[PDB]
Structure formats: C-alpha cells, structure tokens
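pipeline/complex-builder :: batch 7 item 3
reading input block
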Amino acid sequence: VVIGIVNNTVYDPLQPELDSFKE
Amino acid sequence: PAICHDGKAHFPREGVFVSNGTHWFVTQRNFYEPQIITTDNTFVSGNCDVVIGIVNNTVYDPLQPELDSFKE
Amino acid sequence: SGWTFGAGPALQIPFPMQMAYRFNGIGVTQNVLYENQKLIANQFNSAIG
Ligand SMILES: *[C@@H]1O[C@H](CO)[C@@H](O[C@@H]2O[C@H](CO)[C@@H](O)[C@H](O)[C@H]2NC(C)=O)[C@H](O)[C@H]1NC(C)=O
Ligand SMILES: *[C@@H]1O[C@H](CO)[C@@H](O[C@@H]2O[C@H](CO)[C@@H](O)[C@H](O)[C@H]2NC(C)=O)[C@H](O)[C@H]1NC(C)=O
Ligand SMILES: *[C@@H]1O[C@H](CO)[C@@H](O[C@@H]2O[C@H](CO)[C@@H](O)[C@H](O)[C@H]2NC(C)=O)[C@H](O)[C@H]1NC(C)=O
C-alpha cells in the first residue's frame, strides 16, 4: 500500500542471545 | 477501564480498551484500528481488587510460545 | 461527551474515564484516578460545596 517503501533488514535482539545460549 | 489476567490490573499504555461483543481489543482514540492485547500495549500496576469495573481476559505474551517451542 | 463535541458531533464516554484521560494529559499516570476514585470524588464534592 505504501508508495516509496524500500527493502532492508531489521535486527532482532532476542534471536542471537536466544539461539547462542539455548543451543 | 482495566483487564485482570493473574490478579494484577493491566492498563492500556496509549489507547482505550474496546470489545465487539466476544473478544477484547486495544485501539487508538481518533480512529478504529483494533489490536491484540499483548504485554507491550499494557503496563501492570497494582492488584485486582482496587479498581471498579474491571473485567477478565488473558494477555498474550509473544515471548512464551516463540521461546518455549524452540527451546525444546 | 467530554471535549469531543467541540470537533463535530457529541461522542459518548463515561465520566471517570474522561477524568482519567485529563489526568493523563498533564503527566500523571491514569492508574492514579482508578486507585483513588472515591477520594477524588469526595474532594470535588467538598470543593464545589
Ligand atoms: C524487495 O524484495 C522482494 C522479495 O524479496 C522483491 O519482490 C520480488 O520482485 C521480483 C522482481 O521481478 C519478482 O520477480 C519476485 O517475484 C518478487 N518476490 C516477491 C516475493 O514478491 C521486491 O522487488 C524488492 N523490492 C525492490 C524495491 O526491489
Ligand atoms: C469480534 O471479533 C472477533 C475477533 O476477530 C471475531 O472472531 C472471529 O470470528 C471469525 C468468524 O467466525 C473467525 O473466522 C475468526 O477466527 C474469529 N477470530 C478469532 C481470533 O477466533 C468475532 O466474530 C467478532 N464478533 C462480531 C460480532 O463481529
Ligand atoms: C475473574 O476471574 C476470577 C477467577 O476465577 C474470579 O474470581 C472468582 O470469583 C468467584 C465469585 O466471587 C469465586 O467463587 C471464585 O472463588 C473466584 N476465583 C478464585 C480463584 O478465587 C472473578 O470473579 C472474575 N471476575 C468477575 C468480574 O467475575
């Protein structure tokens, strides 16, 4: 719907701290 | 005015609680846009027996399923 | 209808929630009124009397 949106990535803080520790 | 989950009152962070008849929602003031009541839209303050007009519901915590499913 | 009747047509809202919203508008968390509704009502009744 929005006109002018661009592609990028958002950094999730929970994922690294989780998969690095819960593994 | 408030929603009780585990004996603790939950107040909307920015908005007013609303219900269509069966389920409860939280939405802004000047435009109808319901959202699911989570732990990010509400802040806990007090207990469940001081507020007049409180109701019952369950606040969905995104941490619980997403972390317990993977941690198995 | 609170202050909403100054924009367009009147919009319903209970008075305690309007008072809580007025408190929220001046930097006081809205739980204060709901935790002290009776005291504030008595203070207002005494002040206006
Ligand atoms: C942002 O990424 C999406 C998908 O990663 C891009 O959508 C694709 O665009 C190409 C261009 O022809 C198509 O062939 C694909 O089928 C599209 N994929 C999907 C899932 O729709 C999108 O173009 C990217 N944005 C920009 C500005 O390039
Ligand atoms: C009030 O809103 C709820 C939430 O969307 C509605 O529940 C949905 O009803 C449809 C139709 O049966 C289902 O397909 C959805 O799965 C229901 N949602 C959930 C989360 O289960 C409900 O129908 C609405 N009530 C009225 C009277 O509009
Ligand atoms: C919200 O849920 C709680 C939990 O069940 C209700 O508390 C119960 O109230 C009934 C009636 O007073 C008691 O018989 C039960 O023993 C209570 N539960 C517990 C665990 O003690 C509460 O009443 C509900 N809220 C409303 C407005 O009905």
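note: The two ends of chain A are 39 Å apart (CA to CA).
queue -> next item
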